[PDB]
């Protein structure tokens, strides 16, 4: 699916990402946008032979197993294909386990290159939430 800015904002909010581990909602909307361009079926093979999956680009080497990846720790205990749905529940729940580890949101490179230190509350100003 390709979401709209406020459409996504309201759904991340329904799943509890507003202020999850103190990251305001706009942080999440902004990272969906520079990771997947709001497209839930986004998939990107990475030089190390792993693939990033779904709207928050969760990686198969650590977070989900997809069969094809050398060393899959599968820490979210999820099939990577579960992340290509249009129901964001499983991509959110694993995002909650990624952001509770050490680096918070810095896990996502696009967030800490395009969102961190900008007015991310702009991604939700205008939405009915």
């Amino acid at each position, epitope marked *: 699916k390709v979401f709209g800015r406020c459409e996504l904002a309201a759904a991340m909010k329904r799943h509890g990402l507003d202020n999850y581990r103190g*990251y*305001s909602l706009g942080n999440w909307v902004c990272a969906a946008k520079f990771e997947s361009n709001f497209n839930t079926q986004a998939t990107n093979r990475n030089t190390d032979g792993s693939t990033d999956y779904g709207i928050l680009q969760i990686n198969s080497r650590w977070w989900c197993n997809d069969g094809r990846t050398p060393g899959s720790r599968n820490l979210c205990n999820i099939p990577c294909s579960a992340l290509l749905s249009s129901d964001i529940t499983a991509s959110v729940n694993c995002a909650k386990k990624i952001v509770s580890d050490g680096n918070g949101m810095n896990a996502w490179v696009a967030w800490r290159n395009r969102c961190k*230190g*900008t007015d991310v*509350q702009a991604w939700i*100003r205008g939405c009915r939430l």
Partner: antibody, heavy 116, light 108 residues
Framework: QVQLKESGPGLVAPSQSLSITCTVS????????VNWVRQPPGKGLEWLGM???????DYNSALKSRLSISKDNSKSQVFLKMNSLHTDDTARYYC??????????WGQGTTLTVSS | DIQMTQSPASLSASVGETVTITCRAS??????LAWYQQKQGKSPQLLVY???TLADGVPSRFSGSGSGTQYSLKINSLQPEDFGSYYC?????????FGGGTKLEIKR
């Protein structure tokens, strides 16, 4: 360990211009915005302006013509310049770190007295 | 722009009392409210952000509340170390504005 220290000129004459530096240590200026707040002796806090991690700056509506903010990322330095000073800008001037819509680390302050 | 109306200006209460401070906004600020405590001649320090979250290291006797335009800071069983000034600040767009302050003072 996050530190914000501001350095001003202490006393300055009315109608001249003021530059205060705020040097930071412990975070990169690219990733956090820094605010400038000030407190007149025996008065509340007043927001002056900010510069976001990406360099965009915002200001108090009413002091917009007099304030100008900028920063040198390399140097870890934010700069505040006021102009057309009046005895009313006699206050303690603080810079604060902003980390996702809360000012979480403040500096000690620098007092500025504007007198002839 | 949005202005904050803090109330009361000053408040006398005994240690162990439970006090409640109030900020009212001229617009919906959508829970982007922070509260700062300032002790005698010290830099303010962050207490509650995004309306209800206690900052790192802050005690459980402190609790933020509100939505839209009416926000509150409740302090329960006041300690000696809680007297001083309290400021709210909104964070909905720029410019940000602080309320006036509430000076919590020891009743005697």
């Amino acid at each position: 360990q996050v530190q914000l220290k501001e350095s001003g000129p202490g006393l300055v004459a009315p109608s001249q211009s003021l530059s205060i530096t705020c040097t930071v240590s412990g975070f990169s200026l690219t990733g956090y915005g820094v605010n400038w707040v000030r407190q007149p002796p025996g008065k509340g806090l007043e927001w002056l302006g900010m510069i976001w991690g990406d360099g965009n700056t915002d200001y108090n509506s009413a002091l917009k013509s007099r304030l100008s903010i900028s920063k040198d990322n390399s140097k870890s330095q934010v700069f505040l310049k006021m102009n057309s000073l009046h005895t009313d800008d006699t206050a303690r001037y603080y810079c604060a770190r902003e980390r996702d819509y809360r000012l979480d680390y403040w500096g000690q302050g620098t007092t500025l007295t504007v007198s002839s | 722009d949005i202005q904050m109306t803090q109330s009361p200006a000053s408040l006398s209460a005994s240690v162990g009392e439970t006090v409640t401070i109030t900020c009212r906004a001229s617009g919906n600020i959508h829970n982007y409210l922070a509260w700062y405590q300032q002790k005698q001649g010290k830099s303010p320090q962050l207490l509650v952000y995004y309306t209800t979250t206690l900052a790192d290291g802050v005690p459980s006797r402190f609790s933020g509340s509100g939505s839209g335009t009416q926000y509150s800071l409740k302090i329960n069983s006041l300690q000696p170390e809680d007297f001083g000034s309290y400021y709210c600040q909104h964070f909905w767009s720029t410019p940000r504005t602080f309320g006036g302050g509430t000076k919590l003072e020891i009743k005697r």
